[PDB]
Design a protein around this nucleic acid. Structure first.
Lengths: 174, 156, 113
RNA sequence: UUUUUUUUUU
RNA sequence: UUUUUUUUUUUUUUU
RNA sequence: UUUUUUU
RNA sequence: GUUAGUAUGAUCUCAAAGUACCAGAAGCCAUGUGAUCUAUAUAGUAUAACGGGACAUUAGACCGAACCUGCGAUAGAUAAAUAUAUCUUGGAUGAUUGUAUAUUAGCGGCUAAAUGUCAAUCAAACAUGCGAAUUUUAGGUUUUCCAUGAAAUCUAUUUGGAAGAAGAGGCUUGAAAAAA
RNA sequence: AUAUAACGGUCGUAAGGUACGCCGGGGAUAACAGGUCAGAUAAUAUUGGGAGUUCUAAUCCUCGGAUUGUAUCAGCACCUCCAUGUCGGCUCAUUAC
RNA sequence: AGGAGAGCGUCUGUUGUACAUCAACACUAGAUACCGCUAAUACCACUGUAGAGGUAUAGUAUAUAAUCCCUGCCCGGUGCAGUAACAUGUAAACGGCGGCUGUUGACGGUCCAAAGGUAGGAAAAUCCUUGUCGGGUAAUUAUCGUCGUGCGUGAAAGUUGGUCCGACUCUUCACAUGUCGUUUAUCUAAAACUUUUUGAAAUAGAAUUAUCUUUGAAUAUGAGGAUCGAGAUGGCCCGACGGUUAGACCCUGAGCACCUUUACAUCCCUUAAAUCAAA
RNA sequence: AAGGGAUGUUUAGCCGGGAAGUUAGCGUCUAACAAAAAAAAAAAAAAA
RNA sequence: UUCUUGGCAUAACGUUGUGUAGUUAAA
RNA sequence: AUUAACAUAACAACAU
RNA sequence: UGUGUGAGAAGGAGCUAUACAGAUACAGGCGAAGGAGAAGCGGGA
RNA sequence: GGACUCCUUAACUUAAACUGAGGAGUCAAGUAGGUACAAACCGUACAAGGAUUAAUUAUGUCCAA
RNA sequence: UGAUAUAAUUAUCGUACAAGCACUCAGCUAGUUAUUGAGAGACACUCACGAGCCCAAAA
RNA sequence: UUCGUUGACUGUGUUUACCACGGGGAAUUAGAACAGAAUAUCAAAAAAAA
C-alpha cells in the first residue's frame, strides 16, 4: 500500500500556539499600553457551523482601542470590567479610570457583569459605577508610596512596596 | 553572532581621557590645609599632596552647578563650563599652559632631569583647543605662530 | 527568498543636498517618473524629490585573503585605496577612524577604517 | 605601578 | 424461602 | 436462637 | 552632623591551567632491524641422486622401488605430533628433486594471480618513542552522624536515545501555644 | 549586490560498496522462533436456507450468534535472547481424547 | 583404480576456491598495437643501468585458447589515428543490437533506429527444484534419446563438433560381502579394573543442595500449599539458559582500514609556455 | 589551459529491521469529562 | 484649547557577515 | 625473626 | 471572576511567499432604498 | 522527552503488558499489616531510639489461626 | 522442639533476576594544585585599614 | 463635485503589553513633554404692528 506523509507530521510541527482569549480578569488594575484581549484577523470557512469559542471576537466598550490585529487594549489607568449585550449576544470589555488604592471588599459590587441593550446604556452604567470624578477626586485608602518595580530585563521578580526603599511621590496616577 | 557590530565601543575605548577632579575634594583639602590658597595652585602641588595622581592632565568638573565659596587661581589643563563659571563668579582664575609628554614630566618631576627641556610648539589641534578655551575664559599661556598673527591682522 | 516583482526606485532631492528616499512601484509603469514634495532637513524646507535613473567583479573574504597572502591581483585593492585617497580621507587632523595610512613601522592600527 | 574617588550638600 | 461466598491454599459443610 | 403464608 | 572601597589568610574547581578523578581500543607518523623460515627456475663463484620390467622404442609413453608429496576413513583434538599414526594417494627422463655462499625491505618486495607469502592469525610486518594518545560508549571510585530535599517537563539543535551539550522551570514561604 | 527554500541560517552543488572485517557498546539473522493477543480459523450445540423431494432434524452442504479452545495463517509491541531452510532422519520415551 | 550408453571437456604441470557444494591459473596455436638505435619499455640519483654488447623472422604490451571448421550486421558513441590547419579509416581494440496491428499465416499497413540475433546449440554451470513421447525396473518425477513451444542464450566475445582421449557428473551390468532385518564366539591391547611408584588442569560468591502443583512475560534445590526416612563407590547424560572459546549478524559511533568514472581539493609526470647557456 | 597516476577528505534528517514513496519557514480546520448544569438533600410557603 | 494624518498587507520584507552607502572644525 | 588466609593437635560440654 | 490549550507517520481535497504612487493611501463630502412594468447594457458615490 | 491503576478519549481486530493525550493517588525515593506465593491495590495518629501496655481498620469470628 | 525470614553490588520505569565481576587472604591503587580566579536572586568563611588601600624586581 | 494632499516627514528620551534567549517582530498608549517644516476643517449671524 501507500501513504502520503503530511507536511505538518512529526517532528515538523507548530511549536507556537494561537493563545487567543482574555488576558485580564475583572477588578484588575491596568495602565495604557497593556493588551486586554488578544484576537486574530484570520477567519476560517463555515464559522456558523462550529462548536469552539475562539471563533468569536469581542467588541470594544469604554476606554479601549482596537489594534492592527483586532486586539483590544486599554487607554487609561483603571480596572477591567465586563458587560454583556442582549441586542447582540456578545461580551464587551469596559475600563473604569481609578487611582491606585487598597481594594476593599465593600467595593466589589462595582465590577459586576451586567446586561445592556445599547452602547448608550453601557456608558450610563459606567458613569454610575465609576468611583469618583477627576475634577473632584476623593480620599484615597492607603495609596502607594514606594517606587514601582524594576525593569523585566533587570529582575524578573521584584518586591512590591519595599519598606527599605524611601517614599516617592505618585504623579502617573493622575 | 546575532547582534551587529558596534565600532563606537572600541573606537572610544582607546581614547586618552584626562583625570577628573571634583571641586568638593578640593574644598575639603583646602579646609584641611593641605593646599595653600595664598599662592597659585598647580599640578605639582596637587600631585605632591596625594590628592589626585596626575599622569596625563587634571580636569575640573562641578556637580549640580554648586557655587564655590573660596577664591583661588588654579592651573589645570582643562575644566568644565560649570566649574569655570563657579570659579569666576567669586573671582577665581583658571590658567592653562601647553605642555607635551616630556614637558609634563619635567614640570612635575624637575629633580629627575639634570638639564631642563625646552617647551615645544603646539599643533593645529592643540592651537584650536587653546583658542576655544580662551573663549570660555581660561588664561591661556602659549607661544603664538606667525600664520595666525598674519591672518588676524587682516581679519580684525 | 522574496518573489516580489516590484521595481526599486530612487528619489533624490532637487536642492543638491544629497538627500534620497526609498520606495517601490509597480513594474508596468516602467516609463513613469515619480515626483513628490517631502521634507528636506538639509534646508529646513519642503523641496521637490524627483526619481533618478539609477543604474562588476565582487570581492569576497576568500579573494581578499588570497590576494593578501599570495600577492596576486593587488590592483583591485589599490584602486579602492586610490579612490579613498582622492576622496577626503587620511587627514592628519580631525580624524580617528583613519588619520594615517600606516604607523612608522608599517602597521594599520585602526581596525575600522 | 594597579584599583577606587558622593551626583547629595543651609 | 433464608443463613453458606471465587471457601478456587488444605480439612469440613458438622444447619 | 430460622423466617414467611392479608381478610 | 550622610561616599565604602582596597588588599591578605582558608575552602572549592563552577566554560581556567603545554597533565585536570583513575584504568582502558582499532590506529597514524618518524627512526631502525630482519631473505638463517618463506617467495622469486640456486642467476655456474660451486654442485649431487634416479635399483628393475613390458618385441613400450630416441617420447609430457605405462607398472614399479628409493626420493618428493600425503586422497579417503578411523583415532587423537588438555595430543605419543600446537598439521602426527595405518592403508593400494599422486609424480617418478621431466614447468625431476636436492645443496655451499648470495640479491629484492613496508609510501615495499615476491607472486605459472589465492589478498597466497616476507621469523608459526600482515586488505599493509616487527623494535623504540619526554612524537610523554583520542573516546557523547562503557568499568571502578575508599569513615560515620545529622539538616534539607528532585525530575523523566518546554524552546532550540535538518531531534535522535540508553536524560548528550546550552537556556528556562522546580528549593528555606509561612507559621500552628491564651483566663472574665 | 549573490547564496543559506536543509529557510535557529558552515552547503563550501564534495558519491557508493565491502561475503577480506578489526575495536567499542547494545541483544534484532531478510515469515519478528517462544510467551501474550484470538482477526481468519478449530470443538459442541442452536437457528435460517438448500439436498435426501413422500419427509425440516437416518444422513449431508451452507449462514448468523453464544461458550470453550488455539492446532495452522496474517500481524507483531517495551517483554524474552540461540545462531539453519526458524528441521530431515536414527536411538530411546511420557501423557490426553 | 572393472563392461556398456550418454552430458561436458587440453591435458602433463601450479594451487584449496569470484554464489546455489561440484573452481581457477598456466600452456602447444593464431591474431592486434608501439618501436629504425643514445630504439620502445622498465627502475625513477638521471650524460646511469636492464632491455642488449640484441637490430623489424628483433624487442615490448593487451585479449582469446587445439593441430582444421566456411568466422554473422552496426562508426549515431568514449578514445586513439588523420586534418577542411576537427572529411575519412580502425568492431581478432574499445557498451552492444526493438513496438502496434491484420490474413498455421510466404504476404499487406504504420512508428522508431547506426544496426535492428545470423547460424548453431537449446528443459541448459543458464528457465524451472515433476514440459510431451520412447528405452530400463514389480514402481522412475532421478537419467539417455527426441520434439523445438515455456522461458530464453549466442560465433577468434569463441558457438557447434567427426575420430581419439579422462582422478569429470550421472544412468545401468557382474563377483564377493555382518552395510543390513539382527545380532554371536575366540584372541589381542598406547582399551578397561586392582596394587606399587608418583602425582595435573578447566571450575569455584557462600552452603547443611527435594517430589508434585501454582506463582515470577525471562526463570525454581531456596517463594505459597501438599507430600516426603540419610551416606559412599561404579555406570548414564534428562535438567542447573552446564564450562571453555570455534563461527557469525546489527549500530546514534559526531571511529579506524582497503578498493573505486566522490575527479571536489592537492601533489607528481606528459603537453603547452618561458629562461640561460649564446657573438 | 588539457591528459595519466597517486594522496587527503566528504557523503548528516524521520516511522520503519531495511529499501522505496512522502515531507521540512509561517499561518490554519475537526474535541469527549456534570446535577448546589433541575426550587429533583440543604429551597419556598407556614393558616408558626 | 487644538475637528485629520507617519499608509497597505487573512503570507511580512531572510538574522549575522561581505560589498555598497553614511559620519568625525574634539577632552 | 615475621600478620592474615591455610594445615594439625590438646583441653573444655549432659535436661540427655 | 470562568476562560486558554490538536499529542500520536490520526482524519481532511487546508496552502499561492504574490498586489498597490492610488476611481488600492487618502482630510472633507457623497453613497446602494420592495413588487409589477419598460430596456436587453454582467455598473452605488 | 516514565512504569501500574481511576474517569474521558485517539489508533487497533471496541483485540495486546503495545502507540499516543487531558487530571488525581501510589511506586520511583516506603518499613512493618491485609490481599496464599515478587514494587503499583486498601489502611496508616505511616520506620530518632529502648521495654512483657491501652485503642474500632482493611477486615475477621468451625479446624490449621 | 515452637514461631519467623528471598546473599551482596551497579545500571534500570521496574525488589528488574537465572544479566556483568568476584574461591580466600596479604601488599599497592582512583578529586592533585591559585606569586595567575571568585560571589553573579540553587545557596560563599574570616582579619586589618579606611576615602582611602597595595607595592613590583634590585635590597 | 468630475473637489484637496504626499504625513509613505525630519530630531531629542531608555518608561511600558508578551517573555528561556534571540526578532519590543501575528505587529501595545498621546512615553499626553520638547525643537522644525507640511496638509485638512473654521467660528458667529438673536429680536418681524401686543
Amino acid at each position: 500500500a501507500s501513504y502520503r506523509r503530511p507536511s505538518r507530521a512529526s517532528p515538523t510541527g507548530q511549536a507556537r500556539k494561537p493563545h487567543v482569549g482574555v488576558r485580564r480578569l475583572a477588578a484588575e488594575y491596568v495602565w495604557p499600553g497593556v493588551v486586554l484581549v488578544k484576537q486574530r484577523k484570520v477567519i476560517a470557512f463555515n464559522v456558523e457551523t462550529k462548536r469552539r469559542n475562539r471563533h468569536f471576537k469581542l467588541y470594544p466598550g469604554e476606554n479601549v482601542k482596537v489594534s492592527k490585529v483586532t486586539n483590544l487594549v486599554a487607554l487609561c489607568h483603571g480596572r477591567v470590567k465586563f458587560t454583556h449585550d442582549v441586542s447582540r449576544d456578545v461580551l464587551v470589555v469596559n475600563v473604569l479610570p481609578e487611582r491606585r488604592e487598597e481594594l476593599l471588599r465593600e467595593d466589589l459590587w462595582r465590577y459586576r457583569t451586567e446586561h445592556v441593550r445599547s452602547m448608550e446604556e453601557n456608558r450610563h452604567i459606567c458613569f454610575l459605577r465609576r468611583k469618583a470624578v477627576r475634577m473632584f477626586g476623593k480620599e484615597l485608602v492607603n495609596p502607594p508610596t514606594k517606587p514601582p518595580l524594576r525593569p523585566f530585563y533587570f529582575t524578573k521578580y521584584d518586591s512590591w512596596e519595599n519598606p527599605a526603599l524611601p517614599d516617592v511621590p505618585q504623579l502617573d496616577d493622575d | 553572532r546575532r547582534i551587529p557590530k558596534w565600532p563606537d565601543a572600541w573606537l572610544a575605548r582607546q581614547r586618552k581621557v584626562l583625570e577628573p577632579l571634583n571641586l568638593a575634594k578640593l574644598r575639603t583639602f583646602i579646609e584641611s590645609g593641605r593646599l595653600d590658597t595664598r599662592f597659585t595652585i598647580t599640578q605639582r602641588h596637587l600631585n605632591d599632596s596625594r590628592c589626585v595622581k596626575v599622569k596625563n592632565g587634571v580636569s575640573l568638573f562641578n556637580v549640580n552647578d554648586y557655587p564655590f565659596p573660596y577664591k583661588i587661581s588654579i592651573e589645570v589643563a582643562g575644566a568644565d563650563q560649570s566649574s569655570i563659571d563657579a570659579i569666576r563668579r567669586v573671582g577665581g582664575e583658571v590658567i592653562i599652559v601647553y605642555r607635551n609628554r616630556l614637558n609634563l614630566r619635567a614640570h612635575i618631576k624637575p629633580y629627575k632631569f639634570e638639564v631642563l627641556p625646552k617647551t615645544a610648539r603646539p599643533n593645529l589641534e592643540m592651537v584650536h583647543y587653546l583658542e576655544k578655551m580662551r573663549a570660555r575664559g581660561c588664561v591661556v599661556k602659549y607661544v603664538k605662530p606667525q600664520w595666525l598673527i598674519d591672518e588676524e591682522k587682516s581679519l580684525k | 527568498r522574496s518573489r516580489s516583482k516590484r521595481l526599486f526606485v530612487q528619489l533624490k532631492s532637487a536642492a543638491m543636498t544629497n538627500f534620497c528616499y526609498v520606495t517601490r512601484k509597480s513594474p508596468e509603469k516602467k516609463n513613469f517618473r515619480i515626483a513628490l514634495r517631502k521634507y528636506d532637513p538639509g534646508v529646513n524646507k519642503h523641496v521637490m524629490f524627483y526619481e533618478a535613473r539609477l543604474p562588476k567583479k565582487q570581492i569576497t573574504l576568500s579573494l581578499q585573503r588570497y590576494i593578501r597572502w599570495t600577492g596576486k591581483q593587488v590592483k583591485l585593492l589599490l584602486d579602492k585605496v586610490e579612490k579613498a585617497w582622492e576622496y577626503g580621507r587620511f587627514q592628519k587632523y580631525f580624524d580617528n577612524q583613519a588619520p594615517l595610512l600606516t604607523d612608522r613601522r608599517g602597521r594599520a592600527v585602526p581596525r575600522y577604517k
